[PDB]
Amino acid sequence: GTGYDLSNSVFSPDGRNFQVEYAVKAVENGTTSIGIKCNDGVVFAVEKLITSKLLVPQKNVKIQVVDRHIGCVYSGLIPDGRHLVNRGREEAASFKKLYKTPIPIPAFADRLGQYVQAHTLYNSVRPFGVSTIFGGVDKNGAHLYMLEPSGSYWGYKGAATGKGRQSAKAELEKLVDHHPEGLSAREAVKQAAKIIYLAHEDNKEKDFELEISWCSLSETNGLHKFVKGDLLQEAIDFAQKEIN
Amino acid sequence: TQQPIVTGTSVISMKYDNGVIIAADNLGSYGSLLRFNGVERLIPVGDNTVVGISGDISDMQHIERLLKDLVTENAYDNPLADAEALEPSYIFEYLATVYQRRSKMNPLWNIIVAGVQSNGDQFLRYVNLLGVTYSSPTLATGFGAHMANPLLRKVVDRESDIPKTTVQVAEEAIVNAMRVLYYRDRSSRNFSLAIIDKNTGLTFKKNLQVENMKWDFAKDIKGYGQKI
Incomplete structure (x- = not known):
């Protein structure tokens, strides 16, 4: 029969969970955002559609930080994204409180992982309407991650989601090939600004507003910080230039 | 209800014309045993506030973790975290709020929050395990309340005398007091001192030591009433 797509935890005859798939649609329909892993950190950047001239510039921020070393960006239903970060934030505090050391990126990934996967087990909850790219620097390196509404997630060299995930992914793949030695924090910041422009x-x-953030063991001391002023303009231009 | 085990003694402080000074020795007593000597009892929060804690060390360490979190949490979704950021008055009002503990009969436990805020104003307020709070040009906890306040009030007797007081004059009074505490108090010779100046910012001095002590006259004192 049919109707296997009306309840969240239901398995369709071919073993799928249609409600989760419909959640993905909401994600693909959203703004594009990406993540670039470099030789000692990670960079996050997202598109910010300027619906009107009334939007106070630089105000409506999207990238979020978890603890002091984790950066999170997502595409899809923004409110759902915040919800997932609030959790992650608690998830992180809880970890630190008991183990003293700030939560390892992989460990953090599974926390969000498990929590999201949880919202695909019962029909009394809706799956998350966002795909999230997050990462940071920890006891041993930098880590980049992307999480699907299904709760699935993996480690990435580069990652992207949203409206122009393909343009992005295309670009990202180039970078991966043309830099087998590893990109640099400074480099990635510009490269990112470009990929957002292309995508x-x-x-x-619609006109958009750029937003970047990064976490580099050397450039930010392993802490998540937003790219502002000069370094932002420098990257905005690096893109504006190659867009032509 | 509990009872303090490892403890820290006095915490002295005062405010001068451009900021505030606060100091505390580096001892962690365990009863009458001076067990720990590398104990920092001055917790800096940001660059405009320093929190001096005395009392149960274990509870102090808890309050520390609380502050580091207050920092982290304030940074969340706050693009002005380093601009229009934690104020000393915020940090204090929070800690004071955390009355609750005494109201739940489990105090904590232990504080003097010293700092400047942004509008240049000096902040100096006290709060203890009972949740009692107050402010004065000078503030000291425990022993210092008995021996340091008297000296520091000489500081700056009234308000205010603040502008009339320089950092040198002030830091001097503080350092002298620390020596006095060493003479009469569960105190250590080694201490830390911090100045939060509305211009120079936060200056945090570590490993200071009581110097220039008069002990010599002791040789002239024999017996308890005996000539040799």
Whole structure:
């Protein structure tokens, strides 16, 4: 029969969970965002559609920090994204409180992982309407992650989701090949600004606002910080230049 | 209800024309046993506040973790975390709030919050295990309340005298007091001192030591009433 897509925890005859898949649709329909892992940190960047001239510039921030070393960006239903970060934040505090040391990126990933997967087990909850890219620097390196509404997640060299995930992924794949030695924090910051600009074509109708953040063992001392002023402009231009 | 085990003694402080000074020895007593000597009892929060804690060390360490979290949490979704950031008055009002503990009969436990806030104003307020709070040009806890306040009030007797007091004058009074505490108090010779100046910012001095002590006259004192 049919109707296997009306309840969240239900298995369809082919073993799928349609409600989760429909959640993905909500994600693909959202703004594009990415993550680039470099030789000692990670960079996050996202597109911010300027619906109107009324939007106070630089205000409506999207990237979020967890603890002091984790950066999170997501595509899809923004409110759902915040919810997932609030959890992650507690998840992190709880870890630190008991073990003293700030939560390892992988450990943090599974926390969000398990929690999201949880919302696909019962029909009394809706799956998450966001795909999230997050990461940071810890006791042993930098780590980049992407989490699907299904709760699935993996470690990435580069990752992207949203409207122009393909343009992005395309670009990212180039980078991976043309830099087998490893990109640099400074480099990635610009590269990112570019990829957002390129991937903005699949939405070229509306004007957007760039937003970047990074966590580099050397450039930020392993702490998550937003890219502002000069370094931001420098990267905005590096893109504006190669967009032509 | 509990009872303090490892403890820290006095915490003295006062405010001068451009900021505030606060100091505390580095001892962790266990009853009458001076067990630990590398105990920092001055917790800096940001760069405009320093928190001096005395009392149960284990509870102090808890309050520490509380502060580090207050920092972290304030940074969340706050793009002005390093601008329009934690104020001393915020840090204090929070800690004071955390009355609850005494109201749940489990105090904690132990504080003097010293700092400047942004509008240049000096902040100096006290709070203890009972949740009692108050402010004065000078503030000391435990022993210092008995021996340091008297000296520091000489500081700056009234308000205010603040502008009339320089950092040198002030830091001097503080350092002298620390020597006095060493003479009469569960105190240590080694201590830490911090100055939060509305211009120079936060200066945190470590490993200071009581110097220039008068002990010599002791040789002239024999017996308890005996000539040799």
